[PDB]
Amino acid sequence: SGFRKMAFPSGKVEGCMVQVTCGTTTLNGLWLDDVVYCPRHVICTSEDMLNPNYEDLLIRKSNHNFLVQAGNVQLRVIGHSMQNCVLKLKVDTANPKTPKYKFVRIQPGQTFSVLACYNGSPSGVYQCAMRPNFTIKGSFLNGSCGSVGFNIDYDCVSFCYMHHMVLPTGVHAGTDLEGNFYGPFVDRQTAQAAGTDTTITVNVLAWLYAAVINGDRWFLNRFTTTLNDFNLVAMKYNYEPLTQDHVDILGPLSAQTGIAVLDMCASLKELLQNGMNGRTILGSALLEDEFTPFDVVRQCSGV
Amino acid sequence: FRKMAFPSGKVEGCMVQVTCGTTTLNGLWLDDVVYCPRHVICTSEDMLNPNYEDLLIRKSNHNFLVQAGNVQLRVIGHSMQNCVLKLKVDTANPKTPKYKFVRIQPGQTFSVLACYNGSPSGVYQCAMRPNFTIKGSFLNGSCGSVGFNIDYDCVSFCYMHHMVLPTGVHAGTDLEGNFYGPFVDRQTAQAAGTDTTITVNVLAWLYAAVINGDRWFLNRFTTTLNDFNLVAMKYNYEPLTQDHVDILGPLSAQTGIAVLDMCASLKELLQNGMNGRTILGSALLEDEFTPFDVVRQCS
Ligand SMILES: *[C@@](O)(CO)[C@H](C[C@@H]1CCNC1=O)NC(=O)[C@H](CC(C)C)NC(=O)c1cc2c(OC)cccc2[nH]1
Ligand SMILES: *[C@@](O)(CO)[C@H](C[C@@H]1CCNC1=O)NC(=O)[C@H](CC(C)C)NC(=O)c1cc2c(OC)cccc2[nH]1
């Protein structure tokens, strides 16, 4: 019963957050085994960040230039390398609370939990989606760099995001844990625009099914649509196309509710053309697109 | 603005499962006591119309299975406190945080750590409604999940889950076992009173809008607290208390907008509507962010 934007429990990640400081620059790092991972622009001064030659700036640093604090303990750095936009500090102590983990690069439209941290201290946890334009609508303040995004399956933490940048529009950009940005962004102190921000259609459909499972059907209709005719209307409204894989992925929700996927497409088509007429769905006045089909299935299966 | 939960790790380290017969739910292990909903002692048929004092008389310490994961914690004492059971166990939890038990007011927010079989599953922010329900997300097996706030290093537990209502909202107790609202722990359909909008939180939201430069709704008027409360009630808004006025103090100081001037602005929004305008990008006035949440997300 109910449907809420839900994050994974954050404790396995909290036990890995540390504080990294180089010069007057401080941000968060992720301590796994005997390595601390953090945004490489920590090595930068304020003047460097405008056009940093990172390889040039890094070679001029020594292991002792990096102060890593874990709680009240300082960890001694005994090596350091760079992998794209991520710095890897070898420390002489393995983190005893390292969980089972993997690094993965998430696909646009997928969700993950963010543990927002400041000065190496966890501050809040929330769910995000990787948008089609590879930005995320995060909540991050000064000092949040190095905060990470993750999913958990059984006991294994899959890290997928590390935070680097806020755009002029107030959305956020970052990298995977191999240091590659999501999107066309660069770790330099410049104002950057993203590509056009399309709506994650398969997710909107999942959330409509969640609304039905929770007792709201006001937006359904007796009509159907073909997949192509739906996509024509969806693209007109800057929605992503729905693929046959999306249709299949929605199967379990369609089975649970008895609403054919293309019948829900016809409902969404009507909502796009007519608007919501001051009504709300699951408490929202907008069509929500940051819950995946699996997000809905795991909260609403059996209800 | 977004709902943000507290990091959940300090609470995760306290979740256990408690079973009596085939009835299983979650409990909270702090020091050498495990707290859980007292209906764990019920068979399914017992929960239709339970006499808990009589049911408990028939239970002894050795009838309670407490597990941290798969590891059993031997129960060495038990007692009932309102609608919660307290099981003394022979092991003090080494992960016990600094904590307190608090009873919150409508409008206050908290994080819920939803758990199943003693295993944390998800975390999300909830607000206590004026009708003493929360809009949670809870499946079978979720009872005994807790809600909490974290202040510095101290976990303040405020909620333990017991009930879903026919409308699909949730009800529960504080950690002394006293329900929020008129609800009882019985297998029966129970109705919550009509709900109202949480005025103090809408005001916090309007302050948040002003902080971010969105201030078209500020008007030239003020009001008294009494006159405002009487108007607000005709729009299904809660009356403000003195505590509400006080907790708006910091946002009022930050923006320079007196609390009663902002109340007069809200009154105009209620009486005249939004005129197809938005506030913080929304035609809806948000009532699930407290003044603390607004400060916590702006700094
Ligand atoms: C990190 O904490 C820095 O360590 C920080 C996080 C942002 C602070 C405010 N909210 C955030 O998410 N990131 C930055 O400060 C980055 C630093 C880069 C990677 C060197 N820069 C930006 O976020 C950035 C710079 C500019 C800009 O310039 C000029 C103009 C407009 C936006 C903008 N963002
Ligand atoms: C706990 O897991 C029980 O241990 C369970 C939580 C609900 C299950 C599905 N989602 C939940 O939030 N709580 C219950 O099952 C309670 C048990 C009481 C305390 C003895 N029962 C209800 O919440 C319940 C019973 C009825 C009902 O009956 C008749 C009719 C309508 C609603 C309703 N809710």
Author numbering:
A (entry chain A): 1 to 303
B (entry chain B): 3 to 301
Give the original sentences from the paper that presented this experimental model.
The SARS-CoV-2 main protease (Mpro) is essential for viral replication and is a primary target for COVID-19 antivirals. Direct-acting antivirals such as nirmatrelvir, the active component of Paxlovid, target the Mpro active site to block viral polyprotein cleavage and thus replication. Residue 166 of Mpro, although highly evolutionarily conserved in coronaviruses, is proposed to be one of the critical sites for drug resistance in SARS-CoV-2 Mpro, with E166 variants showing the largest decreases in potency against nirmatrelvir. We determined the cocrystal structures of SARS-CoV-2 Mpro E166A, E166V, and E166V/L50F variants in complex with PF-00835231 to sub-1.9 Å resolution.
In inhibition assays with nirmatrelvir, the E166A variant of SARS-CoV-2 Mpro resulted in moderate resistance, with about 30-fold potency loss relative to WT. The E166A variant maintained 15% of WT catalytic efficiency, while the E166V variant had only 6%. The E166A variant, which shows a smaller 30-fold loss of nirmatrelvir potency relative to WT, yields a smaller 9.2°C decrease in Tm compared to WT. In each of our determined structures, PF-00835231 was bound in the expected conformation with strong electron density observed for the covalent bond between Cys145 and the carbonyl of the hydroxymethyl ketone warhead of the inhibitor. In complex with PF-00835231 or nirmatrelvir, Glu166 makes three key hydrogen bonds to form the S1 subsite: between Glu166:OE2 and Ser1:OG, between Glu166:OE1 and Ser1:N, and between Glu166:OE1 and the nitrogen of the γ-lactam ring. However, in each of the inhibitor-bound Glu166 variant structures presented here, all three of these hydrogen bond interactions that define the S1 pocket are absent. Both E166A and E166V variant structures demonstrate this alternative N-terminus conformation. In the E166A variant structure, both active sites showed a resolved N-terminus in the same noncanonical position.
